[PDB]
Amino acid sequence: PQITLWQRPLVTIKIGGQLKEALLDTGADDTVLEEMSLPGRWKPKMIGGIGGFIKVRQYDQILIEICGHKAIGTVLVGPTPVNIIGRNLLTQIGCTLNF
Amino acid sequence: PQITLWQRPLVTIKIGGQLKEALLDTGADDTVLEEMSLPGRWKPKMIGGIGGFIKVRQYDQILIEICGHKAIGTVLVGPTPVNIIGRNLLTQIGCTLNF
Numbered sequence: 155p156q157i158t159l160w161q162r163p164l165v166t167i168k169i170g171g172q173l174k175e176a177l178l179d180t181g182a183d184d185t186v187l188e189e190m191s192l193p194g195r196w197k198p199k200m201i202g203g204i205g206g207f208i209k210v211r212q213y214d215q216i217l218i219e220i221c222g223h224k225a226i227g228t229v230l231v232g233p234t235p236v237n238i239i240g241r242n243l244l245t246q247i248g249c250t251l252n253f
Numbered sequence: 254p255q256i257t258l259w260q261r262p263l264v265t266i267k268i269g270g271q272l273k274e275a276l277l278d279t280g281a282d283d284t285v286l287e288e289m290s291l292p293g294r295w296k297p298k299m300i301g302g303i304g305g306f307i308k309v310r311q312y313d314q315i316l317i318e319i320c321g322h323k324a325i326g327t328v329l330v331g332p333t334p335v336n337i338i339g340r341n342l343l344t345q346i347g348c349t350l351n352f
């Protein structure tokens with residue numbers, strides 16, 4: 155995959171045996187998913203976007219397959235507008251910005 | 254350039270005479286720059302992100318030099334915490350996201 159930005163960089167992620175859609179976001183440091191049920195213990199987090207801060211739950215060493223690419227790492231679950239794959243997951247699947 | 258996302262994807266941009274640092278961010282449909290002065294007329298607008306919505310003043314057909322390359326298009330000016338170059342000019346500079 156080589157993706158252009160004429161349209162939202164949307165992918166299908168598989169987390170929990172579920173297909174969800176997420177935006178590829180390079181502006182995003184962490185991966186933020188909408189509310190859902192993940193395994194294990196969480197910690198608390200406050201990330202700040204364009205509209206202010208939200209507080210999320212941090213989950214570690216979570217398995218997420220993103221466009222058939224398997225990443226394992228930190229996911230943050232909270233009141234976001236959409237599912238964001240951040241730079242934290244972009245680098246594990248070998249993502250590059252190019253121009 | 255091929256850029257890696259281990260570090261935040263920051264670029265220097267030249268807009269309305271001034272050099273600024275902005276974040277290349279493919280999660281953003283629109284380029285939103287922190288409060289500055291743009292010549293011409295502007296239409297009020299509210300765009301959301303993580304955190305909620307912010308009020309912006311949309312100037313149209315602003316010329317900008319992101320890493321040398323000149324893009325034309327709409328810049329919004331508001332209390333964005335960081336200057337954000339979104340999909341609307343990225344495309345213009347032949348930015349692609351590859352993995």
Ligand SMILES: CC[C@H](Cc1ccccc1)c1cc(O)c([C@H](c2cccc(NC(=O)CCNC(=O)OC(C)(C)C)c2)C2C=C2)c(=O)o1
Pocket residue numbers: 179181182183184185186201202203204205235236238240278279280281282283285300301302303304335337339
């Ligand atoms: C600036 C960093 C922060 C996210 C972050 C920061 C630190 C660590 C992790 C994540 C951040 C990045 C991002 O790309 C966004 C995104 C964003 C950024 C700039 C502008 C917009 N709005 C637009 O482009 C126009 C309207 N789009 C829109 O409403 O989209 C949604 C998804 C809300 C429906 C939206 C957001 C939609 C997800 C943001 O809100 O906040």
